[PDB]
Amino acid sequence: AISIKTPEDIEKMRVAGRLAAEVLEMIEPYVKPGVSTGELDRICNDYIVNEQHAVSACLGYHGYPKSVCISINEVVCHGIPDDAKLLKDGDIVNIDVTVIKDGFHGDTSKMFIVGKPTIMGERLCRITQESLYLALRMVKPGINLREIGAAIQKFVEAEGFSVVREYCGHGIGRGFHEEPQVLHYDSRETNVVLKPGMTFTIEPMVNAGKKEIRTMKDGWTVKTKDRSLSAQYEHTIVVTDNGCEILTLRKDDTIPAIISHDEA
Numbered sequence: 407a408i409s410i411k412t413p414e415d416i417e418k419m420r421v422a423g424r425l426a427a428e429v430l431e432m433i434e435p436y437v438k439p440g441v442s443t444g445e446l447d448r449i450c451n452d453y454i455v456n457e458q459h460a461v462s463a464c465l466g467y468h469g470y471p472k473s474v475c476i477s478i479n480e481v482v483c484h485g486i487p488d489d490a491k492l493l494k495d496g497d498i499v500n501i502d503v504t505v506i507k508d509g510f511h512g513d514t515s516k517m518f519i520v521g522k523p524t525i526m527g528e529r530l531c532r533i534t535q536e537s538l539y540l541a542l543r544m545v546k547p548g549i550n551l552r553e554i555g556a557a558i559q560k561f562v563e564a565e566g567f568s569v570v571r572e573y574c575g576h577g578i579g580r581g582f583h584e585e586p587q588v589l590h591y592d593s594r595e596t597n598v599v600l601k602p603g604m605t606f607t608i609e610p611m612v613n614a615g616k617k618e619i620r621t622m623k624d625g626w627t628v629k630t631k632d633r634s635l636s637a638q639y640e641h642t643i644v645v646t647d648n649g650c651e652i653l654t655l656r657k658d659d660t661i662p663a664i665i666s667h668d669e670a
């Protein structure tokens with residue numbers, strides 16, 4: 407079933423979501439040419455543990471050995487922080503954070519552009535964030551999750567990009583992954599009517615090239631099959647009585663935290 411969070415549960419999701427957003431805000435001035443993804447991981451984990459008094463949900467997840475995932479360029483997801491992998495001018499890089507605080511999870515990611523943007527890098531990051539934002543503006547009681555997936559896929563494909571099918575957003579709360587599955591494309595299997603107090607993520611992975619992906623021999627790193635660039639942004643939300651509240655909003659987001667469809 408899909409759990410409906412109590413007001414107290416929602417407040418705990420606000421705290422966890424704020425913490426996960428705050429990791430992303432904290433790490434920003436370290437994301438520069440020449441830094442290793444392994445150092446960025448250590449800076450995040452020390453912050454989560456020592457400052458936030460929280461835990462990373464990534465560490466030990468199915469045996470995953472690091473505290474965040476960092477995905478550069480044609481790495482779609484689950485890039486493993488490594489001391490030998492250096493950021494460089496023109497890179498696009500996703501940093502994906504999940505923190506557990508007081509039993510609740512907050513899950514969020516963004517792209518950073520390192521030094522001077524690529525014109526595809528700029529555009530792929532912007533359109534991927536806008537695909538997330540257009541989905542967030544659709545969330546309100548009574549809409550079907552299926553409409554939202556279809557809208558994201560229409561928007562991304564109109565820009566000549568593709569949506570990765572293997573991964574989806576998800577319910578979230580005391581579990582890192584709960585019902586429902588939030589697909590970022592249209593499917594006949596999606597039939598979920600949203601109600602106030604559902605909490606879930608929207609997190610499209612968008613390739614500049616074709617949709618197919620492949621996993622490296624390391625068992626974790628996922629890349630586009632065509633080696634096109636790939637981008638992702640993720641927010642955790644709660645459905646409210648007339649819209650949604652974005653639990654993981656950052657100062658650099660350009661969508662409001664509270665979206666309401668009442669008035670009109």
Ligand SMILES: O=C(NO)c1coc(-c2ccccc2C(F)(F)F)n1
Pocket residue numbers: 463464465467468470474475484502513576609626640
């Ligand atoms: O919901 C997720 N990210 O937003 C998610 C789901 O599984 C994972 C995953 C999968 C493989 C390796 C590492 C991870 C995780 F550590 F959780 F980020 N992330």
Ligand SMILES: [Mn+2]
Pocket residue numbers: 502503504513514515640
């Ligand atoms: Mn995530």
Ligand SMILES: [Mn+2]
Pocket residue numbers: 513575576607609640
């Ligand atoms: Mn997620």
